[PDB]
Amino acid sequence: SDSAINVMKWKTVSTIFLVVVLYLIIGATVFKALEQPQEISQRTTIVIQREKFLRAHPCVSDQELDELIQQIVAAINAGSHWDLGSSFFFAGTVITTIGFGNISPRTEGGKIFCIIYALLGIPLFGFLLAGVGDQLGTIFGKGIAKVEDTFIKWNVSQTKIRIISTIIFILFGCVLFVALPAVIFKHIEGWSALDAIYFVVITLTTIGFGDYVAGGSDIEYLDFYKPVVWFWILVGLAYFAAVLSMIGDWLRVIAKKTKEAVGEFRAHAAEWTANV
Amino acid sequence: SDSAINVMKWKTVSTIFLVVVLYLIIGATVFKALEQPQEISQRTTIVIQREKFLRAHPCVSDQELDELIQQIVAAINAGIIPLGASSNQVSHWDLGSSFFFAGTVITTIGFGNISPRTEGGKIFCIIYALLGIPLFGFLLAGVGDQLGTIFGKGIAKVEDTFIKWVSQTKIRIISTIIFILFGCVLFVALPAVIFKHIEGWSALDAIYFVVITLTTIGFGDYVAGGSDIEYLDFYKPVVWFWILVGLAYFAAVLSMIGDWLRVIAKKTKEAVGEFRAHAAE
Ligand SMILES: CCCCC/C=C/C/C=C\C/C=C/C/C=C/CCCC(=O)O[C@@H](COC(=O)CCCCCCCCCCCCCCCCC)COP(=O)(O)O[C@@H]1[C@H](O)[C@H](O)[C@H](OP(=O)(O)O)[C@@H](OP(=O)(O)O)[C@H]1O
Ligand SMILES: CCCCC/C=C/C/C=C\C/C=C/C/C=C/CCCC(=O)O[C@@H](COC(=O)CCCCCCCCCCCCCCCCC)COP(=O)(O)O[C@@H]1[C@H](O)[C@H](O)[C@H](OP(=O)(O)O)[C@@H](OP(=O)(O)O)[C@H]1O
Ligand SMILES: CS(=O)(=O)Nc1ccc(C(=O)NCc2ccc(Cl)cc2Cl)cc1
Ligand SMILES: CS(=O)(=O)Nc1ccc(C(=O)NCc2ccc(Cl)cc2Cl)cc1
Ligand SMILES: CCCCCCCO[C@@H]1O[C@H](CO)[C@@H](O)[C@H](O)[C@H]1O
Ligand SMILES: CCCCCCCO[C@@H]1O[C@H](CO)[C@@H](O)[C@H](O)[C@H]1O
Ligand SMILES: CCCCCCCO[C@@H]1O[C@H](CO)[C@@H](O)[C@H](O)[C@H]1O
Ligand SMILES: CCCCCCCO[C@@H]1O[C@H](CO)[C@@H](O)[C@H](O)[C@H]1O
Ligand SMILES: CCCCCCCCCCCCCCCC
Ligand SMILES: CCCCCCCCCCCCCCCC
Ligand SMILES: CCCCCCCCCCCCCCCC
Ligand SMILES: CCCCCCCCCCC(=O)O
Ligand SMILES: CCCCCCCCCCC(=O)O
Ligand SMILES: CCCCCCCCCCCC
Ligand SMILES: CCCCCCCCCCCC
Ligand SMILES: CCCCCCCCCCC
Ligand SMILES: CCCCCCCC
Ligand SMILES: CCCCCCCC
Ligand SMILES: CCCCC
Ligand SMILES: [K+]
Ligand SMILES: [K+]
Ligand SMILES: [K+]
Ligand SMILES: [K+]
Ligand SMILES: [K+]
Ligand SMILES: [K+]
């Protein structure tokens, strides 16, 4: 039966689907809980500042403010943004798919080029990213040969030390790829420590909201900085790929276990009930 | 020779690196050529419009205008419509919008129109993304397999009816053509048509929207379901479904293009090698 495996397949898809739907619903209610408040407080104090500027500058007629805001809002759909260095940064947001959005094409032909550039660029960057991941793979692999030698000539031995190696990968990786660059970002951009870590995670997972962008204010920057950020992008993307990938394996495991716990729970509940 | 393959490896990485640098430079100069002009023309006519209300209201402190615009622009990120003729509004963080938000996180499309402002919305977003992205990847994998089989069935029937006086490797060419063509109709063209009519976007803006969304670049300059229009609410559901299946399809296509570049790379390596060896007799 070719249909029988395909039924077992669709069974699995359907259950992961519903778990994802469930993940979205829980997420939606937690986000709403956290943000609908601030949205209300930001809306009332925008309405305050509106009236407080009609009166504290009486020269402005109420009708011309509405025209001023239209001109501002219209020009937000535009804003130099497109110098060589910025347009290079733009190209990086395309091929990495971080896609921050602070800058994006407005011209019919900038958009047509972006389509072509992305379709060829994303796969090309993927090869680089793969190569870079392999390099980091070996460098870390050397380092865990040396720490599965020195810590396997004394204390508690095989299979529990798999757990220790992965902890060192997360801890050293978070220092090198999250913490250290967050420290720099805090000092150089003037972001809070939380905003910087948020920035790191939103950028390296490639979510890339664009609410924060390193090198993105009109600050003066030492031009070692952007280069170093580029390098961090290259290596941070590989590291987050690996980590995201690890978490996937953890969910695969935890899924096996929850299936067995439900099965235990059934087997025992049953021969409790049969015994009656 | 564990070091020998690793040396050959680093050699290849270094060359792809430089090709990528080169790809970025060419890209940068083409984008600049295409955008820097309009940006200059838009900046001079913004400075024009500035003067017509800078000096037609001199009693406004005018350094304080710059502070007013900062407050407006800052509050556009939240998404205020600070008008008296439209002072009553919908919320950006109602359940359906905050559900959409969660989708932009786990897919990593991350459009950015909406994004947490609270210290704790940000802390949740970090946790939510680290667990969510891997979870969605399993779904996306499963969905890809489904489409895999459904198309595989369809090419059993079209590699049967095309059994005329045909080989094992040349019919791979026909299958891939039908995959691009049918896929572009179902996952790019058709939804662009709908998007054009429902959102009022140009046909180009819609296709741009499709490609920027399904590659997961997700600039956020365009977002289906993003205006305060009307919307039938068959619509967003259908868009959700298109996201799910469009992401799987673009994954596959992006993956194919990668193979084509792997091919063309073998060939250019041999052409350069020929060109070297012969060197005009
Ligand atoms: C640490 C910070 C604290 C935060 C809280 C932290 C909370 C914990 C962290 C994250 C949330 C949890 C995420 C992981 C999901 C856990 C739920 C259960 C695992 C799962 O997901 O559903 C599984 C098992 O469900 C069940 O029995 C029913 C139970 C479902 C509900 C259980 C509880 C989950 C709901 C509550 C928690 C999650 C909600 C979200 C939490 C929100 C936090 C923000 C089914 O699907 P299945 O794919 O496993 O099916 C097999 C298998 O998989 C095989 O191996 C083959 O293949 P394959 O899948 O390996 O490829 C397949 O195919 P075949 O053999 O049929 O051909 C097939 O046999
Ligand atoms: C309609 C629109 C069309 C517009 C026209 C646009 C037309 C062009 C279209 C798109 C962009 C360019 C396509 C042409 C190919 C470019 C890549 C150059 C080939 C290359 O790489 O060097 C080759 C051999 O070259 C040389 O001797 C040096 C010559 C390099 C410079 C030659 C021209 C390329 C750069 C300039 C022209 C293109 C620039 C981009 C133009 C922008 C257009 C928007 C050896 O390969 P290798 O040692 O580097 O390593 C391989 C390889 O890298 C493989 O392909 C995997 O990666 P990958 O590079 O393909 O991504 C790895 O896989 P693995 O074995 O590691 O697992 C590994 O096998
Ligand atoms: C918005 S802007 O008009 O001010 N222009 C710029 C913004 C950022 C940068 C820059 O290079 N940032 C480092 C960087 C590099 C590559 C990638 Cl993918 C991401 C990042 Cl964060 C340059 C110009
Ligand atoms: C303008 S708004 O920010 O105020 N609110 C909303 C904006 C958009 C949507 C929506 O459902 N779009 C379909 C959709 C679904 C999931 C994903 Cl991942 C991407 C997309 Cl395009 C809903 C609310
Ligand atoms: C609105 C009702 C439409 C019902 C469509 C049929 C639903 O069944 C499922 O359709 C999948 C897609 O082809 C199959 O692959 C699954 O094996 C099958 O269980
Ligand atoms: C590891 C932390 C590294 C942070 C280095 C911080 C140095 O601050 C520098 O202060 C200068 C004022 O004298 C500014 O003009 C420079 O733009 C700025 O870079
Ligand atoms: C004169 C020496 C050749 C210089 C040509 C410039 C390009 O770099 C070389 O391209 C090769 C592909 O053929 C790589 O895979 C090599 O490792 C690398 O050295
Ligand atoms: C199927 C072949 C695809 C195109 C590859 C042609 C290779 O020839 C030339 O190689 C040079 C490198 O030394 C480049 O400088 C030229 O730009 C390039 O045209
Ligand atoms: C409607 C306006 C269309 C503008 C066309 C934009 C296409 C520009 C493509 C530039 C091609 C780069 C050639 C380099 C290939 C080696
Ligand atoms: C020498 C072996 C490879 C070294 C790997 C990089 C280590 C440095 C950590 C990353 C430093 C950049 C962080 C600051 C980015 C703004
Ligand atoms: C009505 C507007 C016409 C523009 C629509 C886009 C057509 C060109 C898209 C690019 C197709 C070539 C893809 C190249 C694959 C590497
Ligand atoms: C890995 C070392 C950095 C490679 C990228 C160099 C480009 C720097 C351009 C900085 C800028 O955006 O002006
Ligand atoms: C991944 C599948 C989730 C689709 C659930 C349908 C919800 C659509 C929301 C419609 C609305 O917010 O008005
Ligand atoms: C100033 C400290 C910021 C706190 C950042 C914590 C991020 C969440 C930790 C849990 C990771 C899954
Ligand atoms: C054959 C079943 C449906 C095929 C895919 C439909 C997705 C396109 C809908 C686009 C909505 C904007
Ligand atoms: C007039 C519309 C023509 C549609 C072309 C769509 C091309 C999609 C390219 C994705 C591989
Ligand atoms: C200031 C409160 C931050 C903690 C929020 C935790 C959400 C799970
Ligand atoms: C297996 C070869 C497929 C042919 C690719 C080119 C079709 C445009
Ligand atoms: C193919 C598994 C997906 C986890 C990110
Ligand atoms: K990706
Ligand atoms: K992405
Ligand atoms: K993105
Ligand atoms: K964005
Ligand atoms: K945006
Ligand atoms: K994005």
From Swiss-Prot, chain A:
Intramembrane stretch boundaries: 84-110, 193-223
Chain segments carrying region Selectivity filter 2 = 206-211
Which residues make up the binding site for K(+) 1? 97-98, 206-207
What positions does the entry give for K(+) 4 binding?
A: 97, 206
Please provide, alphabetically and separated by semicolons, the GO molecular function terms listed in this UniProt record: identical protein binding; ligand-gated channel activity; mechanosensitive potassium channel activity; metal ion binding; outward rectifier potassium channel activity; potassium ion leak channel activity; protein heterodimerization activity; voltage-gated potassium channel activity
Write out the ranges of the annotated region (Important for GNG4 binding and L-glutamate release in astrocytes).
Answer: 2-12
Tissues where this protein is expressed: Detected in hippocampus astrocytes (at protein level). Detected in dorsal root ganglia (DRG) neurons (at protein level). High expression in brain and lung. Also detected in kidney, heart and skeletal muscle. Not detected in liver. In the brain, highest expression in olfactory bulb, hippocampus and cerebellum.
User: Which chain regions cross the lipid bilayer?
Assistant: 13-33, 112-132, 163-183, 228-248
Binding residues annotated for K(+) 3, in chain numbering: 99-100, 208-209
Which cellular compartments is it found in?
A: Cell projection, Axon; Cell membrane, Sarcolemma
**Which residues make up the binding site for K(+) 2?**
98-99, 207-208
Q: Region entry Interaction with AKAP5: which residue ranges?
A: 253-266
Question: Which reaction is this enzyme known to catalyze?
Answer: K(+)(in) = K(+)(out); L-glutamate(out) = L-glutamate(in); chloride(in) = chloride(out); Rb(+)(in) = Rb(+)(out)
This protein's GO cellular component annotations are: apical plasma membrane; astrocyte projection; calyx of Held; cell surface; dendrite; neuronal cell body; node of Ranvier; plasma membrane
Its membrane topology:
Multi-pass membrane protein
KO phenotype (gene knockout) = Double KCNK2 and KCNK10 knockout mice suffer from chronic basal allodynia which can be partially reversed by treatment with topiramate, a drug used to treat chronic migrane.
- Cytoplasmic side stretches: 133-162
State the activity regulation.
Answer: Activated by various stimuli including intracellular acidic pH, mechanical stretch and polyunsaturated fatty acids such as arachidonic acid. Activated by volatile general anesthetics such as chloroform, diethyl ether, halothane and isoflurane. Activated by arylsulfonamide ML335 and thiophene-carboxamide ML402 compounds. Inhibited by extracellular acidification. Inhibited by antidepressant metabolite fluoxetine (Prozac). Inhibited by barium. Not sensitive to polycationic dye ruthenium red.
The record describes its quaternary structure and partners as: Homodimer; disulfide-linked. Heterodimer with KCNK1; disulfide-linked. Heterodimer with KCNK4. Heterodimer with KCNK10. Heterodimer with KCNK18. Interacts with AKAP5; the channel is recruited to postsynaptic microdomains by AKAP5 where it can integrate neurotransmitter receptor signals. Part of a complex composed of AKAP5 and ADRB2. Upon AKAP5 binding, the channel is no longer sensitive to intracellular acidification, membrane stretch or arachidonic acid stimuli. Interacts with POPDC1; the interaction enhances KCNK2 surface expression and is inhibited by cAMP.
Q: Which family does it belong to?
A: Belongs to the two pore domain potassium channel (TC 1.A.1.8) family.
Protein purpose: K(+) channel that conducts voltage-dependent outward rectifying currents upon membrane depolarization. Voltage sensing is coupled to K(+) electrochemical gradient in an 'ion flux gating' mode where outward but not inward ion flow opens the gate. Converts to voltage-independent 'leak' conductance mode upon stimulation by various stimuli including mechanical membrane stretch, acidic pH, heat and lipids. Reversibly converts between a voltage-insensitive K(+) 'leak' channel and a voltage-dependent outward rectifying K(+) channel in a phosphorylation-dependent manner.
| Domain writeup | Each subunit contributes two pore-forming domains 1 and 2 which assemble to form a single pore with M2 and M4 transmembrane helices lining the central cavity and M1 and M3 facing the lipid bilayer. The transmembrane helices are bridged by the selectivity filters 1 and 2 carrying a signature sequence TxTTxGYGD that coordinate the permeant ions. Up to four ions can simultaneously occupy the selectivity filter and at least two elementary charges must translocate across the filter to convert it into the open conformation.
Give the protein's recorded name. Answer: Potassium channel subfamily K member 2
